[PDB]
C-alpha cells in the first residue's frame, strides 16, 4: 500500500476534478478522503487521495512550493491549481486540478494547510 | 495476471457507457452519445487476491447501432445486464437481452443492474424486480450518477470468477511522487480553467 | 489498411483475410481491434454479404467467422426471406441442414464447437418460423427418425426443439403477428404427441448424460404450455422426482422442471391427481435429505462457501419449495401421515432463510408473508406451524435491516457516523420484514414479547452486547408497534426504555452513545399511542430531543429533528391544549425558547423545526388564537425581515451574507406554509407586498450582473444566491395557492401583483437567466383559479409561451426543467382555460400545434406523456365546440398533421414507451371521421369528387401515406391493415393488437395481409 512510513498532517472529504482543455470542461476524477502525508525520512509532504469503495488513487503528487490555489468562478468552496507531475494513473503527467469541499470553511482550512505543507517542503 | 471478458448489454440510454466511464476515469458523462457496435475497455481492480483485469465489451443498446449483436458475446466469461428504473420498457426488455446472451454464453456469472435510482420519480418498483430469481442472476439497484452501489457488480463478478467469497477490493500501492518544475512555460490555460464553472455546484460535494 | 479488402465485393472474398480480421477483432486490442470491428460491421451490413455465407462456412478455419456468417444469414432470413428467389430459399435451407448434420457426425467438432452448433440450430429455427409446417410438413417426423441414428444427433435435436418451443411460445408476442403466432402454436401442439414420446423414451433409458440434460432442458420449455395430462398420465413425475434428483448433473434442471410442474393448470376436484402432486414432492424431499443434505444442515455456511454450483442449487431449492408450498401446502395439512413432510419442507425454508444473500432472503420472505397472512385468517391452521413460526420470529428479528429513520451507521474504521446518503435500496426490504413480523406477533404475542425481552436482557448483562445486536433488536421492537394491547404495550415499552436508558449510562464513549441514542429515538418515535397516554414522559422526550439538537454528533442531532417532527405529526393535539398541572400549552414553551433550542442547528434543520411548530399550531381551530400562535412563531424571521426591508429600500448590491439571511427567511415561511396550508394566509399577508418588491429588486441585480459580467455571471455564488431568493419566493406563493381555501382572496389580492412582478421579468431576461420555477408557479395558479382569471391566463401565455418554445425547440436536451414545466403549464391551460388558446392569433396557434407534436417526439417521459395528453385533450376541446368555424378550420388545418405525426412516432421504433397513449390518440382521431363528427370536407375541391365522404378520403390519404413511408409493403397489406384498423376504432384492445401486427410486418417483406383478419 506504501503509506506506513508517513504522518497524516490533514484529511478532508473532497471531490477532485481535472480540466479537459480540448472539451473546455471539468471532469470528475474522484470523490473521497484527500490526505496530506509527510514522509518520515524526507519530510516531504504529498497529496494522496483515493476514491470511495474502489480505493483507487485519484491524486498523488508533491505539494510543490510554486503551486498557487486560485478560485473558480462558479464556487466559493473550491480551489483550482496547476500540477506538473501527478502519478495517480501511472506515468508522471501535468494536470489542471479543481478540488471542491463540503463548505467554504473546509475550503479555507485546506488552503491554510496546503500553504503550511508548501513551507514544509521548502525547508 | 489473467483477464476476463465482460459483456455489458441492455437497452439504449440505460447508462452502460456512463457506468463504465465512471469506473475507468471517475467522470460522469451527462450527454447521451449512443454506442456504435461495441467499445472495448480494459478495467483493473486491486484485490486481496491480486489484481483482476476485466476486458469490458460495452455493447450498443439501440437496434440501429447494434453491429454484430450476439457476435460480441462469444467467449464472454461474465456479463452485466442493465436497465433503467425510470423506464419500464427497459425492464420489460431484460428477458430479451438475457435470452440472446445465454444462448451464446451458457454458464457464466451475470449481474442484473437497475440503474438511475438517484432519480426521484422511479417507475420500476423494487417489488417488481424478480426476473433474476429463476435465472440465478445477482441483482443490484445502482446509480452511475450518485455512485450508489457502483462497485458491487464488479466485486460480485470478481468473487465468482476468482472463486473466492471473501475477496475484497484493497488500496492500491501509492508510490512516492516526483519533484518537477520548463523555464519557458506559459499557460494562460489556467485562466480558462478558472473561468469555466465547475458542474453541479448544488451537490453535497 | 490491408483488412478493408473484404469490403470490396467486386473481387472474390479472401477467406484467409476475413479470418485474420475476425481474429484481430476477438483476440486483438487497441486500435487494431477497433478497426477490425468497424470493417466486420460494414461487411455484415452489406446486403449481398449473405451470398458469401456458404463460402465462409465451407472454407473458413475460424469458428467466429462462421458464427458471423450465420448472423448474416439470420438477418436475411428474418427480414428478407420472401424477397428471395425460391431456389435461393432451398439452397439456404439445404446448406444449413447439411452443416448441422455434418458437425454432429464428427465427434471432435460436436464436442468443441458448441457455440457454432447452437448458432446453426437457432438459424435453422429462423427458417422453420418462415417455412414450417406448410412448406416443410415432414420436419418433425424426420427429426424424430434421425434421433435414433446417433446420440449426437438426438442430443442436438433436443436443442433445436427447445429453441423452437422458445421462439413459438415464450418470445412470439413481440416478434410475430397474432395470426402467425397462433399458426405456429397450433402446429407445435398438433405434433407434440410424437415429440413427447421421443422425449419420454430418452428419459426412460438414460441416467445423467449430456443427452439427458438436453432433453430435460427442452422439457422445461414444454412445461410452459403443454397439457397437464402429459405430466400426470405418464410415469414422468416419478422419473423427475426420484431418478433425476439423484445425479447432480441432472439435479439442477429437474428441480426447475418440478418447479414449473408445480405451476401447471390442474383439476382441483380430483383425488388421484392430488395424490400424484403430493407424491412427487414427497419423493423430491426424500432425495434431498438422502443425497444432498439433511434438514439440520447449515445452509448459511454452505452458501457462504460457494463451492461448485451450491449457490444456484440452494436458490433453485428455495424457488421450488416456495412455489410448491404456496400452491399446495393445503394438500399436506389435514393428513397426519403428511405432517412430517409439511414441516420438514418448512424447516428447509427456515434454514434457507438464514443465508446471507439479500435477493434470496427477499424470495423466502415473500413466501413467509404468504404463509403468515394465510394463518392470520384461515380457521385451525396456525397451530400446525407454531414451531416454524417461533423459529421465524428469531430469524426476522436477527436480520432486521436499518429503517430509513435511523441516520447513524458504522464506517470502515469502526466509527459511528452520519450516513453519506440514503439507503434507498433497503426501504422495501424493511417494509416487507415489518409486514411479516407484525403478522407473527399477532399469531403469538406472548412468544414475541418473550423473545424480545430476553434478547434485551442479554444486551444489558453484556453477554451478547454488540451494535449489531442492539440495533436489529431495537428496529424489531419499533417495527411491531400496534400489535400489542395498550396495557401490554405499556409494560413492554416501559421495560424496553428502562433497559435502553441503562445501556446509555453503562456504555461510554461517543460511538456507543450515538448508537443507543439512535435506537431510543427510533423506538419512542414508533410508539405515539404510548406518548399520548403519558404526558410527563412525552414532555421529557421532547426536552431530551432538544438537548440532542445541541449534540456535536451530526447524526444524532439530525435524527433528533426528524424524531421531533415524526412525534409531532402523531401527538400534536397534546402540544396545543393546556395539560393538567402545566401553566401553558407546551407550544407556547416551544415557541418562547425557539432561539436557544435551534441555535446549533443548520438552516434546513431549523426550517424543519418551524415546520413541526406549524403542525401543532394548525390544531388550534379558534382563528384568533391560531393567528396569535402563528404570529409568535414567526417573530424571529419577521423581525429579521423587517430590518432587511428597511435596508434594501433604504439603498440597494446585496452582499452575500444578506442574501443568505433573506433566503433563509423565505425558506422558514415556506416550511411553515407547507404544514399550515390555508391557515398561513395572515403571515403571507404580512410579508406579501414587500416580498414582491424584493423579487423585483433581486431581478434587477441579476440582470445588472449579467450585463456587466456576461452569461458566466449566472454561475457565480452571488447570482446563484440571488436566484435562490426568487425561487423560494415563487415556491412560497405556489405552496400557499396550492392549499388555499379562499380562492376569492387569491384572485382579488394575490394574483395581480404576482403576475405583474414575475411575467415581464421572465419574458425580458436572456434565456439563461429565466427561472423554470416561474412556469411551475403559473401552473398552480392556473390549476386553482384559472377559471376565475381568463385575462390573467391570456397574459401568462403571452409572456412565456413563444419565448419558452424558442428555448426548447432546437434540440431535446437544452433547458430540461423549462421543457418539463412548459408542457405541464400548457396541459393545465388546455384543461382549465381553453379559451386562452381560442384568443391566440392564427400564427401562435400554429406554434401551439407544433409545440404539441414536438412534445411527442421526446423520449423524456415527462414531456412525451403530457404531449400526448394535451393532444387528446385538444381534440376533445375542439369536438365540444360543435359545428362552428373555429372547429371546422381546426380540422382542415390540423387533423392530418395530428394523424401523420401520431403514426410517425407509432412506427419509428424510438418511442415504444408511448404506445398506449399514441394508440388512444390515433383511435380518437380515426373515430371522429367514422362517427361523421367532422362537419366539413377534409380535402380540397380539386383533389377528389364532390360529395366524397371523409371516410373514403381518410382511407385514401392513409394508404398513400403508408405506401410512400413503407414502400416494401404491398398495396394489399396496406389496404387490409387500414380496413381492420378503421373497423376496430371503437375497440381499443383489438385496435392496439392490429397496430402491433402492423409494427411486426413493417420489419420484414411479404407479410400476409390476411393476418389483419385475426379475431
Ligand atoms: N440520472 C442519471 N442519469 C444517468 C445515469 N447513468 C447514465 N445516465 C445518463 O443517461 C444517458 C445515457 O447514458 P449512456 O451511458 O450513453 O447509455 P447507454 O446504455 O450506453 N446507451 P447505448 O446502448 O445507446 O450506447 C446519459 O445522458 C447519461 O448521463 C444515472 O445513474 N443517473
Ligand atoms: C443515551 C443517548 C445519549 O445520551 O447520547 C448522547 C449523544 C450523549 N440516552 C440517555 N438518555 C436518553 C434519552 C432519554 C429520554 O428520556 C425520556 C428520551 C430520549 C429520546 F431519544 F427519546 F429522546 C433519549 N438517551
Ligand atoms: Cl464460435
Ligand atoms: Cl394528536
Ligand atoms: Cl398488392
Ligand atoms: Mg453506450
From Swiss-Prot, chain A:
Signal peptide extent: none
Q: How does it assemble?
A: Interacts with GSP1 and PRP20.
Going by the entry's taxonomy, the superkingdom of the source organism is recorded as Eukaryota
Main location per the UniProt record? cytoplasm
Q: What Gene Ontology molecular-function terms does this entry list?
A: GTPase activator activity; small GTPase binding
Record protein name field: Ran-specific GTPase-activating protein 1
The UniProt keywords, alphabetically, are: Cytoplasm, GTPase activation, Nucleus, Phosphoprotein, Protein transport, Transport
Q: Per the database record, which ranges form the RanBD1 domain?
A: 1-123
Q: Does the keyword Phosphoprotein apply?
A: yes
Q: What's this protein's family per the entry?
A: Belongs to the RANBP1 family.
What phylogenetic lineage does the species belong to?
Eukaryota, Fungi, Dikarya, Ascomycota, Saccharomycotina
Give me the Gene Ontology terms describing cellular component: cytoplasm; nuclear pore; nucleus
Q: Tell me one GO biological process term.
A: protein import into nucleus
Q: Where in the cell is it found?
A: Cytoplasm; Nucleus
* Role: Important for the export of protein containing nuclear export signal (NES) out of the nucleus. Stimulates the GTPase activity of GSP1 and GSP2.
From Swiss-Prot, chain B:
> What's the name of the protein?
GTP-binding nuclear protein Ran
A Gene Ontology cellular-component term? midbody
Q: What class of enzyme is it?
A: hydrolase
Q: What is the effect of changing residue 63 to A?
A: Strongly decreases the relase of bound GDP
Q: Where in the cell is it found?
A: Nucleus; Nucleus envelope; Cytoplasm, Cytosol; Cytoplasm
Which coarse location class describes where this protein primarily resides?
A: nucleus
Give GO terms: molecular function aspect only: cadherin binding; chromatin binding; dynein intermediate chain binding; G protein activity; GDP binding; GTP binding; GTPase activity; importin-alpha family protein binding
Q: Name one GO biological process term.
A: DNA metabolic process
What species does this protein belong to?
Homo sapiens
Q: Where are the N6-acetyllysine residues found in this chain?
A: 30, 53, 64, 92, 127, 152
Q: SUPFAM superfamilies recorded for this chain?
A: P-loop containing nucleoside triphosphate hydrolases
Region annotation Switch-I: where it falls in the sequence: 30-38
Q: Which residues bind GTP?
A: 11-18, 29-35, 61, 115-118, 143-145
The record's section on InterPro entries has: P-loop_NTPase, Ran_GTPase, Small_GTP-bd, Small_GTPase
Q: Which UniProt keywords apply?
A: Acetylation, Cell cycle, Cell division, Cytoplasm, GTP-binding, Host-virus interaction, Hydrolase, Isopeptide bond, Magnesium, Metal-binding, Mitosis, Nucleotide-binding, Nucleus, Phosphoprotein, Protein transport, Transport, Ubl conjugation
Is the Cell cycle keyword given for this protein?
Answer: yes
Positions of the site: Essential for GTP hydrolysis?
62
Cofactor comment in the record? Mg(2+) interacts primarily with the phosphate groups of the bound guanine nucleotide.
Positions bearing Phosphothreonine:
17
Q: Which cofactor does it need?
A: Mg(2+)
Q: Where is this cross-link: Glycyl lysine isopeptide (Lys-Gly) (interchain with G-Cter in SUMO2)?
A: 64, 145
Q: How does it assemble?
A: Monomer. Interacts with RANGAP1, which promotes RAN-mediated GTP hydrolysis. Interacts with KPNB1. Interaction with KPNB1 inhibits RANGAP1-mediated stimulation of GTPase activity. Interacts with RCC1 which promotes the exchange of RAN-bound GDP by GTP. Interaction with KPNB1 inhibits RCC1-mediated exchange of RAN-bound GDP by GTP. Interacts (GTP-bound form) with TNPO1; the interaction is direct. Interacts (GTP-bound form) with TNPO3; the interaction is direct. Interacts with KPNB1 and with TNPO1; both inhibit RAN GTPase activity. (Microbial infection) In case of HIV-1 infection, found in a complex with HIV-1 Rev, RNAs containing a Rev response element (RRE) and XPO1.
From Swiss-Prot, chain C:
What Pfam families does this protein's entry cite? CRM1_C, CRM1_repeat, CRM1_repeat_2, CRM1_repeat_3, IBN_N, Xpo1
Write down the InterPro entries for this protein, in alphabetical order.
Answer: ARM-like, ARM-type_fold, CRM1_repeat, Exp1_repeat_2, Exportin-1/Importin-b-like, Importin-beta_N, XPO1/5, XPO1_C_dom
The alphabetical list of record keywords is:
Cytoplasm, Nucleus, Phosphoprotein, Protein transport, Transport
Under the subunit heading, UniProt states:
Interacts with GSP1/GSP2, polyadenylate-binding protein PAB1 and PRP40.
Q: Does the keyword Protein transport apply?
A: yes
Q: Where in the cell is it found?
A: Nucleus; Cytoplasm, Perinuclear region
Q: What is the official name of this protein in its record?
A: Exportin-1
Its biological purpose: Receptor for the leucine-rich nuclear export signal (NES).
Q: Cite a single GO MF annotation.
A: nuclear export signal receptor activity
Q: Name one GO biological process term.
A: ribosomal large subunit export from nucleus
Domain Importin N-terminal, which positions?
A: 36-102
The similarity comment for this entry is: Belongs to the exportin family.
Extract one GO cellular component term from the record: cytoplasm
| More info | Present with 7080 molecules/cell in log phase SD medium.
Amino acid at each position: 500500500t506504501m503509506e506506513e512510513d508517513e504522518e497524516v498532517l490533514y484529511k478532508v472529504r473532497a471531490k477532485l476534478f481535472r480540466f479537459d482543455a480540448d472539451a473546455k470542461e471539468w471532469k470528475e476524477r474522484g470523490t473521497g478522503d484527500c490526505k496530506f502525508l509527510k514522509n518520515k525520512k524526507t519530510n516531504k509532504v504529498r497529496i494522496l487521495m483515493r476514491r470511495d469503495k474502489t480505493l483507487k488513487i485519484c491524486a498523488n503528487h508533491i505539494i510543490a512550493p510554486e503551486y498557487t490555489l486560485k478560485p473558480n468562478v462558479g464556487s466559493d468552496r473550491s480551489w483550482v491549481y496547476a500540477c506538473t507531475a501527478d502519478i495517480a494513473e501511472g506515468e508522471a503527467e501535468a494536470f489542471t486540478f479543481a478540488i471542491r469541499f463540503g463548505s467554504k470553511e473546509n475550503a479555507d482550512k485546506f488552503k491554510e494547510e496546503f500553504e503550511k505543507a508548501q513551507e514544509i517542503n521548502k525547508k | 495476471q489473467v483477464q476476463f471478458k465482460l459483456v455489458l448489454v441492455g437497452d439504449g440510454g440505460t447508462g452502460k457507457t456512463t457506468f463504465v466511464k465512471r469506473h475507468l476515469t471517475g467522470e460522469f458523462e451527462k450527454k447521451y452519445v449512443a454506442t456504435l457496435g461495441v467499445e472495448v475497455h480494459p478495467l483493473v481492480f486491486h484485490t486481496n487476491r491480486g489484481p483482476i483485469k476485466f476486458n469490458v465489451w460495452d455493447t450498443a443498446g439501440q437496434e440501429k447501432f447494434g453491429g454484430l449483436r450476439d457476435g460480441y458475446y462469444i467467449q464472454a466469461q461474465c456479463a452485466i445486464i442493465m436497465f433503467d428504473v425510470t423506464s419500464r420498457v427497459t425492464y420489460k426488455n431484460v428477458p430479451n437481452w438475457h435470452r440472446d446472451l445465454v444462448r451464446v454464453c451458457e454458464n457464466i456469472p451475470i449481474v442484473l443492474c437497475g440503474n438511475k435510482v438517484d432519480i426521484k420519480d422511479r417507475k420500476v418498483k423494487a417489488k417488481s424486480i424478480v426476473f433474476h430469481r429463476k435465472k440465478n442472476l445477482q441483482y443490484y439497484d445502482i446509480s452511475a450518477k450518485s455512485n450508489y452501489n457502483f462497485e458491487k457488480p464488479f466485486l460480485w463478478l470478481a468473487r465468482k470468477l476468482i472463486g473466492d467469497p471473501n475477496l475484497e477490493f484493497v488500496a492500491m500501492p501509492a508510490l512516492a511522487p516526483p519533484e518537477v518544475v520548463l523555464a519557458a512555460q506559459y499557460e494562460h490555460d489556467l485562466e480558462v480553467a478558472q473561468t469555466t464553472a465547475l458542474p453541479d455546484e448544488d451537490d453535497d460535494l | 489498411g490491408a483488412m478493408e479488402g473484404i469490403l470490396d465485393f467486386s473481387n472474390d472474398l479472401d477467406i484467409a483475410l476475413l479470418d485474420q480480421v475476425v481474429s484481430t477483432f476477438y483476440q486483438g486490442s487497441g486500435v487494431q481491434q477497433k478497426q477490425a470491428q468497424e470493417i466486420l460491421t460494414k461487411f455484415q451490413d452489406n446486403p449481398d454479404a449473405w451470398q458469401k455465407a456458404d463460402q465462409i462456412l465451407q472454407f473458413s478455419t475460424n469458428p467466429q467467422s462462421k458464427f458471423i456468417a450465420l448472423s448474416i444469414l439470420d438477418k436475411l432470413i428474418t427480414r428478407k426471406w420472401k424477397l428471395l428467389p425460391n431456389d435461393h430459399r432451398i439452397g439456404i435451407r439445404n446448406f444449413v441442414v447439411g452443416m448441422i448434420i455434418s458437425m454432429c457426425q464428427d465427434d471432435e467438432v460436436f464436442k468443441t464447437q458448441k457455440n457454432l452448433i447452437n448458432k446453426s440450430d437457432l438459424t435453422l429455427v429462423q427458417i422453420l418460423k418462415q417455412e414450417w409446417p406448410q412448406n416443410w410438413p415432414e420436419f418433425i417426423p424426420e427429426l424424430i427418425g434421425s434421433s435414433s441414428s446417433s446420440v449426437n444427433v438426438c442430443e442436438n435435436n433436443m436443442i433445436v426443439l427447445k429453441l423452437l418451443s422458445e421462439e413459438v411460445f415464450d418470445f412470439s408476442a413481440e416478434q410475430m403477428t397474432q395470426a402467425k403466432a397462433l399458426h405456429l402454436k397450433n402446429s407445435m401442439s398438433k405434433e407434440f404427441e410424437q415429440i413427447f414420446k421421443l422425449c419420454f423414451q430418452v428419459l426412460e433409458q438414460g441416467s445423467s448424460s449430456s443427452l439427458i440434460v438436453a432433453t430435460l432442458e427442452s422439457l422445461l420449455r414444454y412445461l410452459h404450455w403443454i397439457p397437464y395430462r402429459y405430466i400426470y398420465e405418464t410415469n414422468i413425475l416419478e422419473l423427475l422426482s426420484t431418478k433425476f434428483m439423484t445425479s447432480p448433473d441432472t439435479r439442477a434442471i429437474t428441480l426447475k422442471c418440478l418447479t414449473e410442474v408445480s405451476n401447471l393448470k390442474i383439476p382441483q376436484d380430483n383425488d388421484l391427481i392430488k395424490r400424484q402432486t403430493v407424491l412427487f414432492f414427497q419423493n423430491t424431499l426424500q432425495q434431498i435429505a438422502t443425497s444432498v443434505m439433511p434438514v439440520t444442515a447449515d445452509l448459511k455456511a454452505t452458501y457462504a462457501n460457494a463451492n461448485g454450483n451450491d449457490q444456484s442449487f440452494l436458490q433453485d431449492l428455495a424457488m421450488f419449495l416456495t412455489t410448491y408450498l404456496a400452491r399446495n401446502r393445503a394438500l399436506l395439512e389435514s393428513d397426519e401421515s403428511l405432517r412430517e413432510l409439511l414441516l420438514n419442507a418448512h424447516q428447509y425454508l427456515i434454514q434457507l432463510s438464514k443465508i446471507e444473500e439479500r435477493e434470496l432472503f427477499k424470495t423466502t420472505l415473500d413466501y413467509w408473508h404468504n404463509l403468515v397472512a394465510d394463518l392470520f385468517y384461515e380457521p385451525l391452521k396456525k397451530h400446525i406451524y407454531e414451531e416454524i413460526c417461533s423459529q421465524l420470529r428469531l430469524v426476522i428479528i436477527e436480520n432486521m435491516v436499518r429503517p430509513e429513520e435511523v441516520l447513524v451507521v458504522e464506517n470502515d474504521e469502526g466509527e459511528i457516523v452520519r450516513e453519506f446518503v440514503k439507503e434507498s435500496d433497503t426501504i422495501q426490504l424493511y417494509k416487507s420484514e415489518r409486514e411479516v413480523l407484525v403478522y407473527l406477533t399477532h399469531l403469538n404475542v406472548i412468544d414475541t414479547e418473550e423473545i424480545m425481552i430476553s434478547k434485551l436482557a442479554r444486551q444489558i448483562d453484556g453477554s451478547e452486547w454488540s451494535w449489531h445486536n442492539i440495533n436489529t433488536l431495537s428496529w424489531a421492537i419499533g417495527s411491531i408497534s400496534g400489535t400489542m394491547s395498550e396495557d401490554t404495550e405499556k409494560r413492554f415499552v416501559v421495560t424496553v426504555i428502562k433497559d435502553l436508558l441503562d445501556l446509555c449510562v453503562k456504555k461510554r464513549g461517543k460511538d456507543n452513545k450515538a448508537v443507543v441514542a439512535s435506537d431510543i429515538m427510533y423506538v419512542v418515535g414508533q410508539y405515539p399511542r404510548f406518548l399520548k397516554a403519558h404526558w410527563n414522559f412525552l414532555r421529557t422526550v421532547i426536552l431530551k430531543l432538544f438537548e440532542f439538537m445541541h449534540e456535536t454528533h451530526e447524526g444524532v442531532q439530525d435524527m433528533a429533528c426528524d424524531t421531533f417532527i415524526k412525534i409531532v405529526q402523531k401527538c400534536k393535539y397534546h402540544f396545543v391544549i393546556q395539560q393538567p398541572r402545566e401553566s401553558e400549552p407546551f407550544i407556547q414553551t416551544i415557541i418562547r425558547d425557539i432561539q436557544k433550542t435551534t441555535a446549533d442547528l443548520q438552516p434546513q434543520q431549523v426550517h424543519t423545526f418551524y415546520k413541526a411548530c406549524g403542525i401543532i399550531i394548525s390544531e388550534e381551530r379558534s382563528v384568533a388564537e391560531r393567528n396569535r400562535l402563528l404570529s409568535d412563531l414567526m417573530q424571529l424571521p419577521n423581525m429579521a425581515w423587517d430590518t432587511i426591508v428597511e435596508q434594501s429600500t433604504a439603498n440597494p448590491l446585496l452582499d452575500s451574507e444578506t442574501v443568505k439571511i433573506i433566503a433563509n427567511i423565505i425558506k422558514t415561511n415556506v416550511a411553515v406554509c407547507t404544514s399550515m396550508g390555508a391557515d398561513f394566509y395572515p403571515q403571507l399577508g404580512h410579508i406579501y407586498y414587500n416580498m414582491l418588491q424584493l423579487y423585483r429588486a433581486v431581478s434587477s441585480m441579476i440582470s445588472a450582473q449579467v450585463a456587466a459580467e456576461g452569461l458566466i455571471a449566472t454561475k457565480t455564488p452571488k447570482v446563484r444566491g440571488l436566484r435562490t431568493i426568487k425561487k423560494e419566493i415563487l415556491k412560497l406563493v405556489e405552496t400557499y395557492i396550492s392549499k388555499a381555501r379562499n380562492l376569492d382572496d387569491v384572485v382579488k389580492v394575490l394574483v395581480e401583483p404576482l403576475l405583474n412582478a414575475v411575467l415581464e421579468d421572465y419574458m425580458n431576461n436572456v434565456p439563461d437567466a429565466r427561472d423554470a420555477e416561474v412556469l411551475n408557479c403559473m401552473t398552480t395558479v392556473v390549476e386553482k383559479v384559472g377559471h376565475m382569471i381568463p385575462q390573467g391566463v391570456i397574459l401568462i401565455l403571452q409572456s412565456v409561451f413563444e419565448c419558452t418554445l424558442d428555448m426548447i425547440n432546437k434540440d431535446f436536451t437544452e433547458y430540461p426543467e423549462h421543457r418539463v414545466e412548459f408542457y405541464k403549464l400548457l396541459k393545465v391551460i388546455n384543461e382549465k382555460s381553453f379559451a386562452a388558446f381560442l384568443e391566440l392569433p392564427p400564427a401562435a396557434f400554429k406554434l401551439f400545434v407544433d409545440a404539441i407534436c414536438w412534445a411527442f417526439k421526446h423520449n423524456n417521459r415527462d414531456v412525451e406523456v403530457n404531449g400526448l395528453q394535451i393532444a387528446l385533450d385538444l381534440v376533445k376541446n375542439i369536438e365540444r365546440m360543435g359545428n362552428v368555424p373555429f372547429a371546422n378550420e381546426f380540422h382542415k388545418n390540423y387533423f392530418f398533421i395530428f394523424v401523420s405525426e401520431t403514426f410517425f412516432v407509432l412506427t419509428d421504433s424510438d418511442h415504444k414507451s408511448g404506445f398506449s397513449k399514441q394508440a388512444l390518440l390515433l383511435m380518437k382521431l380515426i373515430s371522429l371521421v367514422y362517427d361523421n363528427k367532422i362537419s366539413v370536407p377534409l380535402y380540397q375541391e380539386a383533389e377528389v369528387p364532390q360529395g366524397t365522404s371523409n371516410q373514403v378520403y381518410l382511407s385514401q390519404y392513409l394508404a398513400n401515406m403508408l405506401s410512400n413511408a413503407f414502400p416494401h409493403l404491398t398495396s394489399e397489406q396496406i389496404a387490409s391493415f387500414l380496413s381492420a384498423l378503421t373497423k376496430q376504432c371503437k375497440d381499443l384492445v383489438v385496435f392496439k393488437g392490429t397496430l402491433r401486427d402492423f409494427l411486426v410486418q413493417i420489419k420484414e417483406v411479404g407479410g400476409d395481409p390476411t393476418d389483419y383478419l385475426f379475431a
